Amino acid sequence: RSGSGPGDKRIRTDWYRCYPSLMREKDRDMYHCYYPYLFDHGDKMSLYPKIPENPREWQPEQLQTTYDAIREDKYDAFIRLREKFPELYQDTRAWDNPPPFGEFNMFYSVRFGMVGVKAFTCKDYDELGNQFDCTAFWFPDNQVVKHSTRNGEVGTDKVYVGAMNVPVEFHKPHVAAFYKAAGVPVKHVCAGFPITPDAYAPVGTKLDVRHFKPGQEVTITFQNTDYGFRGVMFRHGFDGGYVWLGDSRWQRRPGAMGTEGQKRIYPGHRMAGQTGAAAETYQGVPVWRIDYKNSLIYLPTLLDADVGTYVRFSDTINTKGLTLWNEHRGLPAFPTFIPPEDEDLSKLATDECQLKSPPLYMYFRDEFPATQLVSQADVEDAKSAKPATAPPKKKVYDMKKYYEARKKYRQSMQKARKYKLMGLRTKAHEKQEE
Amino acid sequence: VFSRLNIPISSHQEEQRTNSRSALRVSASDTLEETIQQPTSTGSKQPLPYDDERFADMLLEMEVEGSLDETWQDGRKAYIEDVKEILEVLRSLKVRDICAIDVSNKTSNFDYMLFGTCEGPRHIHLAAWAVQEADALKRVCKIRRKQVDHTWEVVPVGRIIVNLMQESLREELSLERKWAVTKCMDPLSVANAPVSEGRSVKAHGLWTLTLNLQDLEDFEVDYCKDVLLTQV
Amino acid sequence: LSVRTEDFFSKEAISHARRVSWAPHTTEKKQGAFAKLARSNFGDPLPSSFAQEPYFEEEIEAHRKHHRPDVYIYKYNVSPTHFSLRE
Amino acid sequence: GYTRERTNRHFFVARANAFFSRLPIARVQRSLAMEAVREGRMRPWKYTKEQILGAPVTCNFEYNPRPVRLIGTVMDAHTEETSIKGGLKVYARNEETNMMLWIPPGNPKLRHEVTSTKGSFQHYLDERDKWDEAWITGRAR
Amino acid sequence: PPKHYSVESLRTVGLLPAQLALSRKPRLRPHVGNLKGLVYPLPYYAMWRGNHNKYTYNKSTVCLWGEGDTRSMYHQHYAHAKCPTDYGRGGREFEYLTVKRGKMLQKPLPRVQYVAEGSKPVWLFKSWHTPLSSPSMWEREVQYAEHTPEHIGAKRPLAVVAPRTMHRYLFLMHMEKVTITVSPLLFGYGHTIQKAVLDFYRRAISARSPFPKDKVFLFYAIDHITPRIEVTWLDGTSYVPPVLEGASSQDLIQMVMEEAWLAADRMAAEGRVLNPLAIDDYKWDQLVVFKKVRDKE
Amino acid sequence: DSFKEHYHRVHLPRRLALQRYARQQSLRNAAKGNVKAEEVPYKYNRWWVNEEHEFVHQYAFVEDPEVTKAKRETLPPVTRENIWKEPQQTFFLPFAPYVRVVDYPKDPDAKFLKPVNIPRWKDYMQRTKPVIPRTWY
Amino acid sequence: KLPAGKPANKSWFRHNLIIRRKASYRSRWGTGAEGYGTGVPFSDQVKLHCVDNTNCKHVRLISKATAERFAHCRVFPAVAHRVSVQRFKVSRHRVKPGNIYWVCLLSRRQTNTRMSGLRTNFDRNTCILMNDQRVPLGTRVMYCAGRHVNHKYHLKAVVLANFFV
Amino acid sequence: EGDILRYMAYDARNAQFAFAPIREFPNQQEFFLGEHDDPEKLMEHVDLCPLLFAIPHMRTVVDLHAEHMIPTIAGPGVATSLYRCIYSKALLFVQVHLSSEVKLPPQDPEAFKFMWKDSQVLPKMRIPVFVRVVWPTNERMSGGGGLLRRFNRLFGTEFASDIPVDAAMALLYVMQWSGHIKDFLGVRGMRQRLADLLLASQQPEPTKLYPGTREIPNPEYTVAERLGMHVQYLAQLHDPDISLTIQRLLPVASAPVRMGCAKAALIAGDRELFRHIVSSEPPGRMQTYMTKLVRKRKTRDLVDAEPRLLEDQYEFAAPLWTK
Amino acid sequence: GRAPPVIGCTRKARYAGIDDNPTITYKPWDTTEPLMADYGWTRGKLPKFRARSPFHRQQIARRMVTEMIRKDYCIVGGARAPALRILADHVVELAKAGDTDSRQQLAYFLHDPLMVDKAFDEYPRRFKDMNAKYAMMTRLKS
RNA sequence: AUAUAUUUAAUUUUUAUAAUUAAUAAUAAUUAAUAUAAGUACGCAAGGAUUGAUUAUUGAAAAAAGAAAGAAGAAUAUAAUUUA
Ligand SMILES: [Mg+2]
Ligand SMILES: [Mg+2]
Ligand SMILES: [Mg+2]
């Protein structure tokens, strides 16, 4: 595909909101630094510029400073304040002792994804009443297959992950040889994910669906439906009738006489040809539901792909000037999800291994928000309550009866279904049809 | 518990509708003689006055079974304490002819409708702002700063609506008489014939009805809306 | 995380050299003192930009910069705090 | 010439339809339906068309500032047993309004209950004729 | 259970947050089709370069003073304000993000010198409650005993930073007396030194003081003595501002006022109680002049 | 091939040869029996104030080959229960949520008694980023 | 052919009024039952019923696009096509043919799929007359109002309506 | 362990106000701890009290030089902290009021800045601090009414008959360690201070550094401003006859005293008395600021005593500002 | 809920798989019953061999099935062979069902009532022990 | 009303694996409904702004390294749903 058309001006891109605070390299002197500006001085940091060891190299108006009381006092007070009030100068602790490599970094760490299979389509309703036509994808056997890094350069390290275990007689001889040299089980398809060296996983690592979190945003890549050779009315319809969008020289006023016409078909001209069967990518699709027993992930969107298509799933690094993985929203399973040793998915049921996302909307999309509706009835007793300043607690008269009521409530709340099921099973096993 | 205006509540309510006919709602104890008399009376088969006999019988059975109330149970009802508080606020503002109507049983969007008569746009806006400040505890928005209509103001307070009008516009609308004359909702009303404005070769529909409300006044419509549907 | 009061109010981006001190009682704006004195809120925006080419000279201590002695050795000025080329 | 519309990469050309026996799709659908049932968004149903169509349905839709309460007969059903794609076609006629609703199952805001417990095919035919006449009448002429 | 703020609570209050995933508005991701290869979660780190990550193997770039290969050339400002190893790419190639390989070496922080080990220093609490014109704001913050001049008689070290003020008048509160010796006869050629000293005497008579006549004195030297000024402070120390060729009355006032600030700092360190600066009739007259200037322009 | 195409076709092998010649100096050490990884200096000067008195931070990250090999070879630890059970939040809470309603003063209309802990509307609108020294959300 | 040098389309102002969608395979209107955002808006010269107690019976739409999705942010002017005749004789009765009022849309015959998945096919196209201040000329509404009516843009319309769906 | 304890005591600052247990216990009483140029010193004294936990429920650092905490006539409000007693579990709600000022800002800030730019002497600041003792109903925890009555008759204080001895001794120790035992008082002491200020206003007043002017005001506090601020304090201390005292003091009050009376009536909650004061106030900057003090509908509702004829109509704000 | 990226029944390529998206699609008639299948290039339909019209195609199919039942085999060409094999399977299914409706349907389809009778006589006992695939198709090298 | 040449849009059929560069479709001078800043700032007064949010307008795109004369379905959507 690769586009290369005229484009649609409905989507209003806004790059002016996408520029950080401008900074010039020349403005990186000691008068602009937020912290005490330090000089390299070889093996030890210093507060003064380096003095040339040859006195002949000294400039006529250059001042070789060996002790500046202003800088000394400021640096001393700064260091002593940071040492004596850690909780008060906590934000200044990133100046020295930086976060070490290997740990997850909010602005640096990117991890690999997985390879799913478009399984089926369903419809699910949220708590607000919004319906979502969801596509359920299946992740049969995800496993790190290979590591790659061209010429050992920086930022060129990636990991190749396989999708589906297949027999030996399934692939071509060279693909079978690739998997033999890799030493991992022979997979059906394999996708490469560019990562950072702190997000590596050993070759052969089982990748669980819980690698993703039920509420995050993902980038998916698949192959759309093939429609064959179609016409200009089918693909980019209502266009291609005449040569449009041509910016050439012409006269705006009758003052002069000069024009430059068209003598060929310019590249990008919309005409008939192949339609579909192209690698299509969706960006920022939220995750809806994760079934980690059947290895299923639900996306609230419908695809233009066929059932059985291998879809590459990765994570969207940022959205609207904000990082996906952060302390406010949440942190990922970095580098990948590792199950606990005590877990046994064979003993769990399908209805148990389900993870749902928080609501993706703020109001019933059928109606309007509360600020736009004419009138509404606000009945939210268990959802939330913005009414602060709780009333004073009731004066207790007997700690004995108070603790009795509290323990009774705790015992009636705990083991509401598990104990009931265990008692029912014990009764069914002890009755023996009597 | 406190109401929407932070007022204690001492009067309970019914979660069902008053117009309902449910065995669970009926508290009178049955009698063998009454049952025998009712059986001897029903021994003579006679259809209901509604158009769809099957549908009318099924709807009456559903009503006396009470599943309609189990489906229409709504605990989001308003409170009369808020109506009384708005009444006191409007009385302090000296708003004449305060008329409150409960239309929870009737087909509407609000539980209570208040109607007040104010003399002038200044007084109308003052009363609207005072109702807003009385609802300041739970309100999410304020009223319009610029009056788009100098004779009518609408203030929503939960499921309670407040209309502030002048004498002329109030007498012209006559919404209080409308909502008073309007009978409560009856599930047997949907058993009538459908109506649709369509001119046929003889001005008669085989399965539908044709009624023109242009020749009828507002009060005539308010009084005969259900009457015409029940007759034809 | 949760809502924290630390993120409510923004702090000044003053530099280290232009700062007076790192004390918590001097972390606030410098004009706030006169604002409190005058009992009025000042909302003057964009006070001044640095320059197109902001260049500065090395400042010496308040007493040294005026009581520097004319002490010289072979071809260089000598001070308890500075060295420099002398002709 | 300067672009390409198709992709012949193995990852995209390959399909996984042959390995679908390792995935119980129908069981997952039934599990979703049972989850909806136990959460209370839908109730399990099993009927045929001849015994479902024509039954009055009481539908309460939670809408501000007051839920809308309608009574309308079943005109068609899309699934016999309970399913996440169950569907229900209902004709509801108010005092002067006639509408044809298609209520999906499992929505927490759209609580519809079938009450007749029986079919009433003759009532279905009557409501069908009423809706047809009303629909042909409503067009402006 | 403890309660916290949430999106539902803020909605009930009346505020809705912006949509993150499901929205028909732009999601502000300029790198989806422009940046190729590996992209880092830091947003907009390549927008000033032109929204691309190509041509990163380059070493030298077009750069002004203080950027790039300027380190090999001498500039008076940057030679003392920038380390020759902290020179990066200049222009639009500013490094908002940098990634390198190898073992990171974190050099030890600098050490405060001329501080004896085992010395407990005095800590000065600086706050905005103290007026900025007070020398305490300019005094050292971490002050040791090895920095206190005891030969002068000080209990604390002297201030290291001086106020940056262009002095246009004299403040004779911390000055015991001012004697100005001039020659009676006027030099044949235009004597800028004599003119400047006469202007200095005029401004000292008009200086800021309740009665500057009690402290300013003029003398004539028939011995052809060069015109000079002698300021005796409250402690008895004398200062003689050198009046050289080209110096103006404003320059002499600046010198005298800077030395007066230094002398008052010495007094305060020795323990002398000095009268503070405040509002007076001279300041009211200066306010009249200031209003005149403001009304003019 | 165009001008830039020909230039890159000729020079990319030469760039890789230059990188090999650079790594030759690093391999010089390993042949001496003493292997020392590349030693890059830490940057203590990554916090700045621009011309418009705005805070700027330079993010410099250094990759450790030893940690990279450790992650390539060893197995990652078990995921945290809260990490894999708690869902990712779909909305971003404002740093300074405007409340507009506080039950502290006896008379709610009195503006001069509102507590200063509650953020103002200007704060609610302008605080779209952590405070000046802070860098993480 | 203006401009003389590079002639352009003379429908530049019509493009600012119409809501069009290129009929490719990815962009299609379809029927309203496909989902949310699949109903074709009402074009111009479309007849609607007038259910308020006014002299008018039918109106003709002037708007190039009219739908429920943007009934809260767009103004719909219309002209009174047919007016009821009163053989035996206020502001609502003074409605004369040819006059231009605004219209609040209540229902449509085309399929409308809500975001909750509830499709609806009303009996007939419906609207009520309003002035430039969005105050209905009638005192009562003889039909059902759609859910989109529940918006502050239609305050008086919601007040005068007695049934919503 | 110590690091976590310190960080919890620090995050006590970041704790929110809406979720603070301010009304956790039924009974409450108010006390005035004096006026402080720098109330942060008194706050540090309260923080370092042996009878209170080092981890408070809520802490607010009072920084008068912050753009959101600059004290004005219509000041930012109240900085609030909440401490817990160790032995009785009572609550101390410390309230630093930054809105008690009754001095108008300078008309021309440039002249005031030129005047006070190089001055090396600044006047004191009068910023009030109050404490609300919150305690539950107790019969044997306060040591009976006689113990507190003995404490009151010994130290000239006004404590309730059931206030916990823990909180009583905590307040006493804090005030004595800070050195404001004379400033620590209650309703009776505030009434005595108000009588003293009335006598001082009757007596001739000494000349300050320079007379006040709408252009360049004098930062030093005068007797009338002190009287207004102390009327505000007496209203804050929950005086039962505060409305009667304001009504009796209004006819003989100056402009700052009337501004203080307006603020005091607004604190007490008498909207009718506040509207009466605003309508009786002659037009000027004082009336403009006392109108800006509150959240209103229209300024004429407060300013106009009699209804001003607007478009042959008359508005009435008595129902809006009654009760 | 929203709509798929491509709404409505859109004709895809010959070898394109299913989409499995909510789409209101109707069948011409019940093609699940034997001899009532539809012809097309999707996978749910029989490969439509070349004919002037669907009526002509059905006539060719009827004569093919008639001769198939007549002489137990048939040499056909092109896309007619899969259709003939599937229709022979359908005929065997109808014969094994042996209902009066099945008799009448095979009589409606076939051109020879004697061949209808021959099928219903022979095929049940012939394929009683077979589940499916009653006909064998062999591609010839000529 | 013509594909003859040029030029374009496609294709040369699993290529385990987009990305070191060439070239190339979306660089805000938006519009309308609400609500909040606020019934604030600003006005003699009646009055009354600026303003980052939701809808409204419904879309998503990766180039070249493997063995080739059937239907890429043994065809009635299963990689053989029993099978003589
Ligand atoms: Mg909506
Ligand atoms: Mg009409
Ligand atoms: Mg090939």
What is D65-94 written as a DSSP string? SS-EEEEEEEEEES-SB--TT--EEEEEE-
| Residue D117 DSSP label | -
Distance from the E222 Cα atom to the nearest Cα atom in chain C, whole angstroms: 32
**Tokens describing residue E257:** 């006022």
Structural Rg of chain F based on CA atoms:
27
Which residues from the 357-376 window of protein chain A have CB within 7 angstroms of nucleic acid chain J? 361, 368-369, 371-372
Closest CA to A227 of A302, A191, A280, A269: A280
Please classify residue I140 by burial: count the beta carbons closer than 10 Å to its beta carbon, then call 0-12 exposed, 13-18 middle and 19+ buried.
exposed
Best I6, I7, I25 residue to mutate vs chain G (most G CBs within 10 Å): I7
For ligand 2, the distance from its centroid to the CA atom of residue B196, given in whole angstroms, is: 13
Q: Is the dihedral of CA E49, E52, E53, E58 positive or negative?
A: negative
- Asked if E119 contacts E147 with a C-beta cutoff of 8 angstroms, the reply is no
- Cis peptide bond prior to F108, omega within 30° of 0: no
Q: Where are the alpha helices (DSSP H) in chain B?
A: 32-42, 53-65, 67-72, 80-92, 121-134, 167-173, 175-181, 218-231
Distance, Å, A194 CA → J25 C1':
26
Distance, Å, H258 CA → J43 C1':
26
Distance CA H274, CA H297 (A): 15
Please classify residue A248 by burial: count the beta carbons closer than 10 Å to its beta carbon, then call 0-12 exposed, 13-18 middle and 19+ buried.
exposed
User: φ, ψ for residue H311 (rounded to 5)?
Assistant: 55, 45
Residues D15, D20, D23, D27, Cα dihedral to 10°: 130
Q: Do chains H and B touch (3 or more CB pairs under 8 A)?
A: yes
Distance CA G103, CA G47 (A): 12
- Is H8 near chain C, with CB under 8 Å? no
Max distance between CA atoms of chain E, in angstroms, equals 96
Distance CA A82, CA A97 (A): 13
Distance CA H147, CA H141 (A): 11
By C1' distance from the Cα of H311, the closest nucleotide is J46
Question: Which amino acid does the sequence have at A295?
Answer: S
Strand J close to F126 by CB, under 7 A: yes
Max distance between CA atoms of chain D, in angstroms, equals 67
For ligand 2, the distance from its centroid to the CA atom of residue G59, given in whole angstroms, is: 9
- Asked if E62 contacts A127 with a C-beta cutoff of 8 angstroms, the reply is no
Closest CA to G163 of G120, G93, G107: G107
Q: What letters, b where the CB count within 10 A reaches 16 and e where it falls short, cover B12-34? A: eeeebbeebebeeeeeeeeeeee
Cβ-proximal residues to F38 (8 Å cutoff; 6+ apart), any chain: E101, E102, E103, F26
The verdict on a CB contact (< 8 Å) between B163 and G124 is: no
Question: Which amino acid does the sequence have at A213?
Answer: K
**Tokens describing residue A232:** 């200009």
Q: Tell me which chains share at least 3 CB pairs under 8 Å with chain E.
A: A, C, F, H
Distance CA E160, CA E143 (A): 11
Distance CA G41, CA G65 (A): 5
- Asked if E97 contacts A155 with a C-beta cutoff of 8 angstroms, the reply is no
What technique was this entry resolved by?
Answer: cryo-EM
Question: Which amino acid does the sequence have at I58?
Answer: Q
Closest CA to B23 of B72, B61, B75: B61
Q: Where are the alpha helices (DSSP H) in chain H?
A: 2-11, 39-47, 109-116, 144-155, 165-178, 187-202, 223-236, 242-249, 255-268, 271-280, 285-292, 299-303, 318-321
The three-state secondary structure class of H237 is coil
E242 phi-psi bin (left φ>0, alpha ψ -120 to 50, beta other): beta
The three-state secondary structure class of H293 is coil
- Cis peptide bond prior to H282, omega within 30° of 0: no
Under 8 Å CB pairs connecting chains A and B tally to 20
The CA distances from residue A115 to A209, B192, G143, in Å, are 10, 59, 54
C-alpha angle E164-E170-E175 in degrees, rounded to nearest 5: 105
The three-state secondary structure class of B83 is helix
Distance CA B81, CA D119 (A): 46
Q: What letters, b where the CB count within 10 A reaches 16 and e where it falls short, cover A32-60? A: bbbbbbbbbbeeebbbbbeeeeeeeebee
- Asked if A161 contacts A211 with a C-beta cutoff of 8 angstroms, the reply is no
Question: Which amino acid does the sequence have at F15?
Answer: R
Distance CA A260, CA H236 (A): 84
- Asked if F67 contacts A103 with a C-beta cutoff of 8 angstroms, the reply is no
Q: What strands lie across the sheet with H91-97, from one edge to the other?
A: H27-35, H128-135, H91-97, H78-84
Which residues from the 8-47 window of protein chain E have CB within 7 angstroms of nucleic acid chain J? 14, 16-19, 22-25, 32-33, 36-37
For ligand 1, the distance from its centroid to the CA atom of residue A366, given in whole angstroms, is: 6
Please classify residue E278 by burial: count the beta carbons closer than 10 Å to its beta carbon, then call 0-12 exposed, 13-18 middle and 19+ buried.
middle
Closest CA to H93 of H41, H20, H18: H20
Strand J close to A4 by CB, under 7 A: yes
Structural Rg of chain E based on CA atoms:
31
- Asked if D67 contacts B74 with a C-beta cutoff of 8 angstroms, the reply is yes
The three-state secondary structure class of A421 is helix
Distance, Å, I16 CA → J76 C1':
18
Residues 200-259 of A with CB under 8 A from I: 225-228
- Asked if C16 contacts F136 with a C-beta cutoff of 8 angstroms, the reply is no
Q: Is the dihedral of CA H141, H145, H146, H151 positive or negative?
A: positive
User: φ, ψ for residue D57 (rounded to 5)?
Assistant: -130, 125
Which residues from the 151-210 window of protein chain E have CB within 7 angstroms of nucleic acid chain J? none
Max distance between CA atoms of chain A, in angstroms, equals 111
Distance CA H307, CA G45 (A): 53
- Is G92 near chain B, with CB under 8 Å? no
Distance from the F33 Cα atom to the nearest Cα atom in chain A, whole angstroms: 22
Strand J close to A231 by CB, under 7 A: no
Closest CA to A366 of A140, A125, A50, A90: A125
Q: Is the dihedral of CA F96, F99, F103, F106 positive or negative?
A: positive
The three-state secondary structure class of A63 is strand
CB neighbourhood size of H77 (10 A): 25
Cβ-proximal residues to I106 (8 Å cutoff; 6+ apart), any chain: I35, I91, I94, I95, I116, I119, I120
User: φ, ψ for residue F102 (rounded to 5)?
Assistant: -135, 135
Distance CA H9, CA H32 (A): 25
Please classify residue F72 by burial: count the beta carbons closer than 10 Å to its beta carbon, then call 0-12 exposed, 13-18 middle and 19+ buried.
middle
DSSP calls for H91-142:
EEEEEEES-----PPPS-HHHHHHHHSS-S-------EEEEEEEE---SSSS
Strand J close to D1 by CB, under 7 A: yes
Strand J close to A247 by CB, under 7 A: no
Distance CA G151, CA B201 (A): 41
For ligand 3, the distance from its centroid to the CA atom of residue E62, given in whole angstroms, is: 48
Strand J close to I15 by CB, under 7 A: yes
The three-state secondary structure class of C40 is coil
Distance CA A63, CA A49 (A): 10
Distance CA E97, CA F57 (A): 9
Please classify residue H236 by burial: count the beta carbons closer than 10 Å to its beta carbon, then call 0-12 exposed, 13-18 middle and 19+ buried.
buried
Cβ-proximal residues to E213 (8 Å cutoff; 6+ apart), any chain: E205
- Is G26 near chain I, with CB under 8 Å? yes
Question: Which amino acid does the sequence have at F29?
Answer: N
Closest CA to D87 of D52, D127, D35, D38: D52
- Asked if E264 contacts E274 with a C-beta cutoff of 8 angstroms, the reply is yes
| Residue H180 DSSP label | -
Distance CA G129, CA G131 (A): 7
Distance CA E112, CA A214 (A): 53
E96 phi-psi bin (left φ>0, alpha ψ -120 to 50, beta other): alpha
Strand J close to I130 by CB, under 7 A: yes
CA A176 to chain centroid: 34
Distance, Å, D4 CA → J9 C1':
10
By C1' distance from the Cα of D17, the closest nucleotide is J79
- Asked if H179 contacts H34 with a C-beta cutoff of 8 angstroms, the reply is no
Distance, Å, G50 CA → J56 C1':
25
Cβ-proximal residues to E103 (8 Å cutoff; 6+ apart), any chain: F36, F37, F38, F39, F40, F62, F64, F65, F66
CA G113 to chain centroid: 17
Q: Which residue of B has its CA nearest to H310?
A: B122
CB neighbourhood size of A331 (10 A): 17
The three-state secondary structure class of F95 is coil
- Cis peptide bond prior to A335, omega within 30° of 0: yes
For ligand 3, the distance from its centroid to the CA atom of residue D9, given in whole angstroms, is: 10
The three-state secondary structure class of A299 is strand
Q: Which residue is nearest to nucleotide J21 (CA to C1')?
A: F8
The three-state secondary structure class of D110 is strand
The verdict on a CB contact (< 8 Å) between I3 and G26 is: no
Three-class SS of chain E: CCCCCCHHHHHHHCCCCCCCCCCCCCCCCCCCCCCCCCCCCCCCCCCCCCCCCCCCCCCCCCCCCCCHHHHHCCCCCHHHHCCCCCCCCCHHHCCCEEEEECEEECCCCCCCCCCCCCCCCEECCCCCCCCCCCCCCCCCCEECHHHCCCCCCCCCCCCCCCCCCCCCCCECCCEEEEEEEECCCCCCCCCHHHHHHHHHHHHHHCCECCCHHHCEEEEECCCCCCCEEEEEECCCCEECCCCCCCCCHHHHHHHHHHHHHHHHHHHHHHCCCCCCCCCCHHHHHHHHHHHHHHHHC
Distance CA H65, CA C32 (A): 4
Q: Which residue is nearest to nucleotide J35 (CA to C1')?
A: A371
DSSP calls for A181-218:
HHTSPPBS-EEEEE--GGG---TT-B--GGGS-TT-EE
Three-class SS of chain G: CCCCCCCCCCCHHHHCCCCCCCCCCCCCCCCHHHCCCCCCCECCCCEEEECECCCEEEEEECCCCECCCCCCCCCCEEEEEEECCCCCCCCCCCCCCCCEEEEEEEECCCCEECCCCCEEEECCCEEEEECCCCCECCCCECCCECHHHCCHHHHHHHHHCCCEC
Distance CA I7, CA I4 (A): 6
Which residues from the 25-44 window of protein chain B have CB within 7 angstroms of nucleic acid chain J? none
**Tokens describing residue A175:** 């693909």
Distance CA F116, CA B55 (A): 65
Residues of C whose CB is below 8 A from F95:
7-8
The CA distances from residue A172 to A166, D13, H183, in Å, are 12, 15, 93
Distance CA E144, CA E157 (A): 8
Question: Which amino acid does the sequence have at E141?
Answer: E
Q: Is the dihedral of CA A243, A247, A253, A257 positive or negative?
A: negative
